[PDB]
Design a protein around this ligand. Structure first.
Ligand SMILES: Nc1nc(Nc2ccc(S(N)(=O)=O)cc2)nn1C(=O)Nc1ccccc1
Length: 272
């Protein structure tokens, strides 16, 4: 990763929290192309000081994805490790995370919008699968909306997939349980079962989010009941707008070897 000076970063408003992280809008002063000076809007992800021992995982997450370049993967500018903080410096996406966008705009989001966003997320995951790179935390909060749909110009929305954060292979067990049903059943059994097939299951959970206007699946269940949901081999309920429900259930297959490839997933989506 490129090293960025603390002196060149300005922290502005808080944009919320992630797992053991705090998120801020900021500005980076930099010399750009042709030697021209720029002040660039950035997203700053800050690892909690009391959790500095997760920094290896925090940064290995961002590093692995940033060794590949793709139009549907978020751009990382570098890191700032000046002094006591661990900071990931990332492109600032105008419209933020998909989960809060769906909640605030669920009135004005139709099947064609959901299908376009689903196709774009599948394209990103197909790219990862072809490169045998595991993401490990596919979810609507980790989808960023670069551009809104503009029917007046026939422009579709455009999304990017963010970095996965601290791996489920090092997180506390109670956090993994709270992440049911994004974390697949085999990873609750053994977090070291993390595999390419992990991302197929979470992709299904994420489609459910996209179809449910920002609702969180199984949010009414506490962690003990989320565990028993998997023990009883239940599936999620079909969303009210059910056009994608069969694809959701096909992806959320309790047998990891039976989950469809992303090529097959893209073929399905192209049939609707
Ligand atoms: N790269 C990036 N850009 C933005 N932009 C943004 C814009 C507007 C809003 S708001 N509150 O006005 O709706 C919030 C955020 N967010 N972001 C990001 O990575 N978020 C994130 C993802 C996963 C976990 C934690 C944080």
């Amino acid at each position: 990763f490129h090293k960025i000076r603390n002196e060149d970063l300005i922290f502005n408003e808080s944009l919320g929290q992630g797992t053991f992280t705090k998120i801020f809008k900021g500005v980076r002063r930099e010399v750009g192309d042709y030697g021209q000076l720029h002040e660039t809007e950035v997203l700053l992800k800050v690892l909690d000081k009391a959790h500095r021992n997760y920094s290896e995982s925090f940064f290995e997450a961002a590093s692995m994805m940033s060794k590949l370049s793709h139009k549907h993967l978020v751009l990382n500018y570098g890191v700032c490790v000046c002094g006591d903080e661990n900071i990931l410096v990332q492109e600032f996406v105008k419209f933020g995370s998909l989960d809060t966008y769906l909640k605030k705009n669920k009135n004005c989001i139709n099947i064609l919008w959901k299908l376009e966003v689903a196709k774009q997320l599948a394209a990103a995951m197909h790219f990862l699968e072809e490169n045998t790179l595991i993401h490990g935390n596919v979810c609507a909060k980790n989808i960023l909306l670069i551009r809104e749909e503009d029917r007046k110009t026939g422009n579709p929305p455009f999304i990017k997939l963010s970095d996965p954060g601290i791996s489920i292979t090092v997180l506390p067990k109670d956090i993994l349980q709270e992440r049911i049903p994004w974390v697949p059943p085999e990873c609750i059994e053994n977090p070291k079962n993390l595999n390419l097939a992990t991302d197929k299951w979470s992709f299904g959970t994420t489609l459910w989010e996209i179809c449910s206007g920002g609702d969180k699946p199984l949010s009414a269940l506490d962690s003990q009941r989320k565990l028993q949901f998997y023990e009883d081999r239940h599936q999620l309920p079909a969303p009210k707008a059910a056009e994608l429900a069969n694809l959701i259930n096909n992806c959320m297959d309790y047998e990891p070897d039976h989950r469809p490839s992303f090529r097959a997933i893209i073929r399905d989506l192209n049939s609707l």
